[PDB]
Symmetry: D2
Amino acid sequence: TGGNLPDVASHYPVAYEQTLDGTVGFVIDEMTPERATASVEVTDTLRARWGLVHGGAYCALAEMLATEATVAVVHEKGMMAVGQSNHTSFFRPVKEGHVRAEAVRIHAGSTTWFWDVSLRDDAGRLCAVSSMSIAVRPRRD
Amino acid sequence: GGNLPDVASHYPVAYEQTLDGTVGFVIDEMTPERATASVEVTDTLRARWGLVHGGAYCALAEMLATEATVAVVHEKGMMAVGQSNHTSFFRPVKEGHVRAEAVRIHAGSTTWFWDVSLRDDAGRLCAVSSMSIAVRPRRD
Amino acid sequence: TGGNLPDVASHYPVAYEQTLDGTVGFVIDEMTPERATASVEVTDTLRARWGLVHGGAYCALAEMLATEATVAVVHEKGMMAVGQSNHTSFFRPVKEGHVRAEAVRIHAGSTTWFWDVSLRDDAGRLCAVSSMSIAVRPRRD
Amino acid sequence: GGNLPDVASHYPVAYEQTLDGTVGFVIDEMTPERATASVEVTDTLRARWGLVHGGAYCALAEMLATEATVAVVHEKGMMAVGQSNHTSFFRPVKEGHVRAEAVRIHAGSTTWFWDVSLRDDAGRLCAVSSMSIAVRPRRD
Ligand SMILES: CC(C)(COP(=O)(O)OP(=O)(O)OC[C@H]1O[C@@H](n2cnc3c(N)ncnc32)[C@H](O)[C@@H]1OP(=O)(O)O)[C@@H](O)C(=O)NCCC(=O)NCCSCC(=O)c1ccc(O)cc1
Ligand SMILES: CC(C)(COP(=O)(O)OP(=O)(O)OC[C@H]1O[C@@H](n2cnc3c(N)ncnc32)[C@H](O)[C@@H]1OP(=O)(O)O)[C@@H](O)C(=O)NCCC(=O)NCCSCC(=O)c1ccc(O)cc1
Ligand SMILES: CC(C)(COP(=O)(O)OP(=O)(O)OC[C@H]1O[C@@H](n2cnc3c(N)ncnc32)[C@H](O)[C@@H]1OP(=O)(O)O)[C@@H](O)C(=O)NCCC(=O)NCCSCC(=O)c1ccc(O)cc1
Ligand SMILES: CC(C)(COP(=O)(O)OP(=O)(O)OC[C@H]1O[C@@H](n2cnc3c(N)ncnc32)[C@H](O)[C@@H]1OP(=O)(O)O)[C@@H](O)C(=O)NCCC(=O)NCCSCC(=O)c1ccc(O)cc1
């Protein structure tokens, strides 16, 4: 699939290249029910005007990763998954290189899954973390 | 230039090349205690599922809260940067616009806090973001 | 009811005076579907060893207020309400006096209600805020 | 004295009179990067509905994260205080104990961040708390 997102359906409303994720270059590497990773090359498109990766870019990468990792498991069960809360804290800026995210599932309830995402720079330094709660609900179609 | 606060003669990244300029964030009003901004929904703002990306609301909030702090503190020798962003999502947005309004609720010496509300074209509260902005002496 | 909590049932598992809320002295003042207030006199029981109100005391007052305000509306509809996320940020310490909390409902969905709680000191200063998400689910009994 | 870090000769409030001593919080292990604490469930820890109070998990996390920062920074002339506490609740606890484990994930000059996991007697993760601790020069 585009950006290596889970392929859970034959078509999607928006093609990868046209989505925010495609635009900024997010790509999923590993994907398992309890852990997933993704990364993105830093370019100006990922930065704010001050020159460092935009705080929203870390939120977004976390959001896509944690939601899609949930989607990978729940879609075939007839459920949809969507972000309900995204709490990202920023410890160190990233000027360039990549941002690498690792999502670890820490709770999988019937209505809410929760994932902790660490976002690191190319030296391995923890630049941000995001705690994501993902709502899971039966699909409407 | 997205109408961001004109506080410096040079910025490392031009608006149009930033995440903000790429998705189309524009600031409407800005005062020390309250600031607004908006964006048209386009595919660039969406996830593959066709609804606005959760990261878009976070990003809009982050830019608005931070730049509304920059607008005040930059001329004081300070830099402003997001330290925590908590966004909660109540209703999706499929198309139209997202409109953010940031209300300053605390301005301490090292931290400012803004509540951001993100509404759809019908005025419905689709998401909120509680933004903590660190304020530190600018580096030489 | 004890602490003026909503009286939605004829009995409760734990008497007010014996609960955490009773122990520290939380009391609800106003209670409406979209807004509720409560307050507590600061005594050592509310403080940490350093002498200021414990961060947990603000979390707890917010939690009781936002959950009970939801309970007041949903109990008779056959639902239970319980805290799902409590995010409290601390802006100014409180040494003594009272802490006064005001809870404003900002979203009432079918599964989650969300309340913003402001916690102020006797001078009116905003000492903390809490964003609370309250899960609402059908009661089991 | 709940076995809190013995960093000062006098504290404004004795353990037994604090919120912590009233509900019975006790610290078990403490190192610069990791600390544990626990509490017996009693009615004092509960809401009227019979389950542990959400505020109890928050309080336990707040004390543990803060005091684990105090333990390091106090002798350096710094004070430590909670700046943000985000607790998410996954499973209730009706009785037994709550056991908290705090893991330091960032120690910056002005902010330390701890992840706290709160488990029941069966080891099940009942709640988590992401704690931000401000660190500032102690006032004279
Ligand atoms: C929030 C939620 C209900 C979402 O759960 P879900 O996805 O609908 O359901 P899920 O199948 O994962 O259930 C997980 C566990 O949650 C509990 N639960 C879920 N639904 C229900 C329900 N309808 N009724 C009772 N318990 C339920 C139950 O313990 C369940 O385990 P099991 O009995 O089914 O094995 C669940 O994750 C949960 O129970 N979290 C813990 C909530 C909690 O304990 N919050 C802290 C207390 S906040 C409240 C408070 O402090 C307060 C203070 C003063 C006061 O006056 C009033 C309140
Ligand atoms: C977090 C922070 C220190 C950031 O402040 P800042 O930007 O450096 O400084 P700012 O100049 O805006 O100061 C605002 C107010 O903060 C307080 N403050 C700031 N810095 C200091 C300091 N170095 N020393 C003492 N107070 C300070 C002070 O009240 C100040 O007002 P003023 O005296 O200057 O008029 C300030 O917003 C604050 O104090 N927030 C409240 C923190 C709080 O009360 N947290 C809840 C307690 S969490 C701890 C806890 O529960 C615990 C439990 C058990 C246990 O064993 C240990 C701890
Ligand atoms: C989280 C939740 C589903 C909880 O809702 P609830 O309490 O179950 O249901 P409630 O009756 O209040 O419904 C409120 C509205 O939510 C929506 N909704 C609720 N349930 C469903 C459902 N089963 N299917 C579709 N929409 C639903 C719907 O819009 C509803 O309005 P209506 O059509 O019924 O008038 C709802 O509050 C909500 O939809 N919040 C907004 C979620 C959101 O848009 N999150 C941000 C996007 S996060 C995802 C993301 O960024 C991503 C990025 C990349 C990628 O590859 C994948 C994902
Ligand atoms: C929040 C804080 C400044 C607190 O740091 P602190 O405790 O004062 O200082 P600490 O000594 O631990 O510094 C750690 C690192 O922070 C950075 N930093 C700290 N203070 C400064 C400063 N005054 N100037 C520049 N960098 C600083 C610096 O990278 C430092 O490393 P080093 O150069 O000292 O090796 C630091 O943790 C931090 O920088 N976190 C990352 C902040 C971040 O990158 N947030 C996301 C961007 S949010 C903004 C945004 O998206 C935006 C979008 C659009 C727009 O138009 C405007 C903004």
